[PDB]
């Protein structure tokens, strides 16, 4: 039972992919397993500029999962996960302040992040 995507990636080691949220509903139960997959997808989409607005959706989903996480998880790892979401909050700056230069792009307001 991996608690991080890095450990699973280490153990394990064409065309435009569809929206990662298309099959997100299939992981309603057991979010711990889907957390690693979401983290890996976000890391993969981080490079090559992430097309457009895909990184914002990935970050919003990760932040929502992290907020849901550690709510009633193991007390020993509660502090760590809550710390990890802080990095996402830092990424929120990269998703708000550094989201785009605003020269031509309309960007994406993180209002859902504020509500969460």
């Amino acid at each position: 039972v991996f608690y991080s995507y890095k450990t699973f990636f280490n153990y394990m080691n064409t065309y435009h992919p569809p929206k990662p949220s298309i099959v997100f509903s299939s992981f309603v139960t057991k979010p711990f397993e889907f957390v690693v997959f979401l983290e890996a997808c976000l890391a993969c989409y981080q490079q090559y500029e992430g097309f457009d607005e895909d990184r914002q959706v990935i970050l919003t989903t990760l932040y929502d999962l992290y907020l849901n996480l550690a709510q009633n998880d193991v007390p020993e790892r509660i502090d760590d996960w809550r710390s990890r979401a802080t990095g996402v909050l830092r990424e929120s700056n990269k998703l708000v302040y550094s989201a785009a230069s605003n020269n031509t792009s309309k960007r994406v307001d993180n209002s859902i992040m504020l509500l969460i």
């Binding site: 509903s25 307001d109 209002s111």
Partner: protein, 62 residues
């Protein structure tokens, strides 16, 4: 908020709709009339709310 949304639907943003949906689904109490009103509001103003976020909120709130 509802009066502003109804009067100025042309001048609005999806953030307002999401906030209204969250406020309606907060549900400090439980009532069938409130559920019917929420369903009617969603049907009238569909295609403007985050499906995944709304589904997650509904599942969490039971």
């Amino acid at each position: 908020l509802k009066w502003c949304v109804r009067e100025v639907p042309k001048m609005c943003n999806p953030i307002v709709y999401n906030s209204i949906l969250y406020m309606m689904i907060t549900d400090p109490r439980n009532d069938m009339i409130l559920e019917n009103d929420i369903i009617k509001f969603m049907k009238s103003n569909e295609n403007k709310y985050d499906l995944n976020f709304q589904l997650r909120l509904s599942l969490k709130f039971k």
